[PDB]
Design a protein around this ligand. Structure first.
Ligand SMILES: O=P(O)(O)OC[C@H]1O[C@H](OP(=O)(O)OP(=O)(O)O)[C@H](O)[C@@H]1O
Ligand SMILES: O=P(O)(O)OC[C@H]1O[C@H](OP(=O)(O)OP(=O)(O)O)[C@H](O)[C@@H]1O
Ligand SMILES: O=P(O)(O)OC[C@H]1O[C@H](OP(=O)(O)OP(=O)(O)O)[C@H](O)[C@@H]1O
Ligand SMILES: O=P(O)(O)OC[C@H]1O[C@H](OP(=O)(O)OP(=O)(O)O)[C@H](O)[C@@H]1O
Ligand SMILES: Nc1nc2cc[nH]c2c(=O)[nH]1
Ligand SMILES: Nc1nc2cc[nH]c2c(=O)[nH]1
Ligand SMILES: Nc1nc2cc[nH]c2c(=O)[nH]1
Ligand SMILES: Nc1nc2cc[nH]c2c(=O)[nH]1
Ligand SMILES: [Mg+2]
Ligand SMILES: [Mg+2]
Ligand SMILES: [Mg+2]
Ligand SMILES: [Mg+2]
Ligand SMILES: [Mg+2]
Ligand SMILES: [Mg+2]
Ligand SMILES: [Mg+2]
Ligand SMILES: [Mg+2]
Lengths: 233, 233, 233, 233
C-alpha cells in the first residue's frame, strides 16, 4: 500500500487533485458521412462528437492514470449499468494488460469487479427518482472503491448513489467517468478520472442511449430531431 | 419476422435442434508455461483448458449462428452477472459487427441488452439458494429472449431463473452458454448455442472465478490444489 | 464486380468519381498530453493531428468503399513499403472481415497481397531519385490493381511508380492513401480512396517516419523542432 | 540490453539456449465446422491445426521473450515477405505495447522495421533457387538483427539468406519463426523464438499459402486433397 491511493471520503465527487479532461470546444463535430453507419442508425445520425476510436485512445490514458494511483492496491471497481458497460469493458482490458506487461510486479489482481444498476432518465429528462439495484454494499467497508460511469451531467445519479456507499464506510471513493457535461444543471459533483468535457448536448451512441436506442452504434453522436421524433415516448 | 426465431416455451433448456458444441476430450490441456501468465496468477495456474484466443474464435461462430437465427428480429439479450461479462462483451461486439457488414439490411438493432445478477456458489459448492437481482421482468412479455451465460454445470441457476422468466410470458427463450460441463450432477438443462463441452473439472480464468479470484486471467484453466488452498473460505 | 471495378487507365491519379476524404481544417490539433505517449517519444510529440483510433475508424469506411468496388472480382493490392505497412494491415483485416460477414457468395478471396518498396525521402526532402524494389510486375497484366499508400504529398512517388505499372498493361489502377496533403508542392496526383485531407505540415507517428524514427508511435503527430534537431541527418 | 542481446554469429540457426516451443503432437486437429469459414474457403478447409486466436496468444509470449532479450538496445527486425506479414504485424504490435506499458525508461524504440522478400516454393515443392529482394544489407553492420519468419521447414530459405546477412558483419543474428516443422527434410536450422512445433503436414491459412491461395483465412489448416486439386499448377 501507498498513500497515493488514499483519499478522504469528504473529497468524494469534488475532483480534488485531478488531471483535467480533454476539452471538446463548443460546436466541434465530425460528419457522420465520413464513417460507416449501419442501416438502423443511418436515418438518425448526422454529427459525431467522439469517434469510437478516439474514445478508445483516451481510455488508454485514463487506464494508465488509474494504474498509477492504485498499483499494488486491492481495488474494487463498480460498473454502473447499463450505460457504463462499454467504457468499463475497455478500462478493465487496459488495466489488466498494463499490469501484465509492467516490469514492477504485484501479487494483487489489477481489480475486483462489481455491478450496480442505477436508473434516472426517461427520454432526456430525469424522473426525479433513482432506481438502485446492487449486491449488499457492506462488502465495500474499508475498501478502495472506484465507481465507473459513462457520463456525469446533473450529478444526481452519483450524488445519490455516493451517499449509499458512504454509509458502509469505504476506505476511499473515486469516480472515473468517460464524459462530463458543461451545464448549469450540474450540482458540481465531478469525476476524478474524466475522459472528455463536452458542451450541453444530448449524446447517443457508444452505450449512450435514448430510451434504450443507439447503444450499439460505434461512435458518440448528438441526438438529432429525427431520432427524438422516432424514439421518444 | 421469420419463423426461424420461434421456439416453444416448453422447449426452454432442452437444446432441441441445436448445433452440438466443440467437444474437448477428457484430459486435454495446454501447458501454462507456453503462455504469458501475470505474477498474481503464476503460482496457481498449471493447465490451460481453453486458450483465450480459442474462446474468441469459437464465439465468432456462435455469434454467426445467433445472427442467422434472429436476423431482423427484436432480440432481448440478458447478461447473467458476474460470470458472463466477458463472453457477453465478445458476443455483442460480433453481433453488431456482423450486422454492420451484412449485405442484407435490417432497420432493427442487432440486440437490446439487459443485465440480471444471479448467485449460487461459494468455493466450488452451491449454497442451495439462488440470489436474483433484476429490473422488473415484465418487460420481457412477448419478447424473443436470449440468456447469455458463461457455464452450465448442474443447471440449477438457469432452471430456477428460467421459471421466473416463463412467468412473464416471453415469446421465445433460448440459452447461449460458452461452456457446458459433462457431469452426473446436471439436471439435463442444456443450452441452444454452446461453445464447448468439457469434462468434470472446476475451471478458473476468463471470468470463471473461485471466490472472486482469477476473473482477469486471459485463459480458461483448471483450479489447482495451490489455488484452492490459497483462496478457499 | 466488373461493372464497378472497371476504370480507364488514363484516369489513374485523377481521383475521378471519388468520395471526398474527411477534411481536417488548418490548425486543428489535439494535445499530446491527453494521450499515453511512450518514453522514447515523450520529448518529441506535442501536437496530435490524427488519433490512432480515428485512423482505424476511417479505414473501416475506406475498406467498405473498396469492398463495394471489387467484390466478386480478383483484386491485387500492393503495399508500398515501408510507410504503408500499418494502413495496409488495417485495410486488409477490414476487407477480409467485411467479405466474411457480408453473407454474399463469392469463390474469390477479398484480395491478393503484393509488396513493392519505394524510397524518395531523406529528412523531409526528396532526393530526387526513386528507389524501386519489386517482384516482376508482369504478373499485374490484365489485373485490377489497387496501390496502398500512407501519404500522397508531392505526388512524385506514385507518378513514377504509376508509369512502371502502366507499362505492363493492368486492367485497372486505383490508389488508396490514408492521407493527402494540401500543398502547392503537389503535381495534382490524387487518390481514389483517401482517408484524410490535411494542411501542409510534416507528420510523424503511426508509420509516418523521420529518418526511420517514430513509426511505432500510435498517433499521427506533427514533427516538432526538438524532433527535427535530434533526428535530422 | 547488451548482456542479454549478445550472441555469437556462429550460433545462428542452432536455437542455442532457446525456450522450447509449444509442442503439438501428431494427429492433433480441431474440426473446421466449429469455426466460421468464409465461402471461398469452405470447400477446402477441413482440419484446423492452430486456431488463429491460439496463434495470437502464443505470439504474446514470444513477444515478451523478445522484449526480455533486447530491451534498451537497438533491435533491427526483418520481415520475410510474403509469408511472415501476419506474424510480423502481431509481433510488432505486442513489442510496442509491452515496452509502452513496462514502466521502464528507454529512449530506444522497441524495434526498427525492415523488409526482405524471399521466394522458394511452387506448389509444395522448392524450385531449388532462392529469390532475394532487399535494400542494401550493409545497413545491418554492427546491428542486433532478428529475422521474422512464418515457418521453417527444410531450412533452405533461412540458411541461404543467413549467409548473405553474415557477410555484412551484424552484431548478433536470431530467428523468430511462428512454426517449425518436424521433418526428415530439415537441414537442422532452427529458430530462437519459436511458436509451435508441428508434424510433417503442409499448412495453409493465416498467411500460409498454396500458390498464393488461403492467406486471408483466419486459422492454420491442413492442405486438403480438394485444395491441392483446385489450386495446384
Ligand atoms: O448525472 P446525471 O444527470 O444523473 O446523468 C447521468 C446518468 O444517467 C444515465 O443513466 P440512465 O439513468 O439513463 O440509465 P442507463 O445507464 O441504463 O442508460 C447515465 O448513464 C448516467 O448513469
Ligand atoms: O449450472 P450451475 O451449477 O447453476 O452453475 C453455473 C452458474 O454458477 C456460476 O455463477 P456464480 O453463482 O458463481 O456467480 P458469478 O457468475 O457471479 O460467478 C456461473 O457463472 C453460472 O452462473
Ligand atoms: O508524394 P511524395 O512527395 O512522393 O511522398 C510520399 C511518399 O514518401 C514517403 O515514403 P519514403 O520515401 O519516406 O519511404 P518510406 O515509405 O519507407 O518511409 C511516404 O511513405 C510515401 O511513400
Ligand atoms: O524452410 P523452407 O523449406 O525454406 O520453407 C519456408 C519458407 O517457404 C515459404 O515461403 P515461400 O517461398 O512460399 O514464399 P512466401 O513467403 O511469399 O509464401 C515460407 O513462408 C518460408 O519463407
Ligand atoms: N445518452 C445520454 N444519457 C445521458 C444521461 C445524462 N446525460 C446524458 C446524455 O447526454 N446522453
Ligand atoms: N468458475 C467456475 N464457476 C462454475 C460454476 C459452476 N461450475 C463452475 C466451474 O467449473 N467454474
Ligand atoms: N512521415 C512523412 N513522410 C512523408 C512523405 C511525404 N510527406 C510526408 C510527411 O508529411 N510525413
Ligand atoms: N504454406 C506453407 N508454406 C510452407 C513453406 C514450407 N513449408 C510450408 C508449409 O507447410 N506451408
Ligand atoms: Mg447510467
Ligand atoms: Mg440512459
Ligand atoms: Mg454466474
Ligand atoms: Mg462464480
Ligand atoms: Mg513510403
Ligand atoms: Mg519515410
Ligand atoms: Mg516465405
Ligand atoms: Mg508460400
Amino acid at each position: 500500500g501507498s498513500h497515493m491511493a488514499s483519499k478522504p471520503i469528504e473529497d468524494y465527487g469534488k475532483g480534488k487533485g485531478r488531471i483535467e479532461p480533454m476539452y471538446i470546444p463548443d460546436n466541434t463535430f465530425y460528419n457522420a458521412d465520413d464513417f460507416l453507419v449501419p442501416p438502423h442508425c443511418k436515418p438518425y445520425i448526422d454529427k459525431i462528437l467522439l469517434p469510437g476510436g478516439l474514445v478508445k485512445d483516451r481510455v488508454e490514458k485514463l487506464a494508465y492514470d488509474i494504474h498509477r494511483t492504485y498499483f499494488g492496491e486491492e481495488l474494487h471497481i463498480i460498473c454502473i449499468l447499463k450505460g457504463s458497460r462499454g467504457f468499463f469493458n475497455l478500462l478493465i482490458d487496459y488495466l489488466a494488460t498494463i499490469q501484465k506487461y509492467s516490469g514492477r510486479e504485484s501479487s494483487v489482481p489489477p481489480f475486483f469487479e462489481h455491478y450496480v444498476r442505477l436508473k434516472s432518465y426517461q427520454n432526456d429528462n430525469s424522473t426525479g427518482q433513482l432506481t438502485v439495484l446492487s449486491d449488499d454494499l457492506s462488502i465495500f467497508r474499508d475498501k478502495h472503491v472506484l465507481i465507473v460511469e459513462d457520463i456525469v451531467d446533473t450529478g444526481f445519479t452519483l450524488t445519490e448513489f455516493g451517499e449509499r456507499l458512504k454509509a458502509v464506510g469505504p476506505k476511499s471513493m473515486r469516480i472515473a467517468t468517460l464524459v462530463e457535461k458543461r451545464t448549469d444543471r450540474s450540482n458540481s459533483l465531478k469525476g476524478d478520472f474524466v475522459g472528455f468535457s463536452i458542451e450541453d448536448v444530448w449524446i447517443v451512441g457508444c452505450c449512450y442511449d435514448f430510451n434504450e436506442m443507439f447503444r450499439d452504434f460505434d461512435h458518440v453522436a448528438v441526438l438529432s430531431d429525427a431520432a427524438r421524433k422516432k424514439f421518444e415516448k
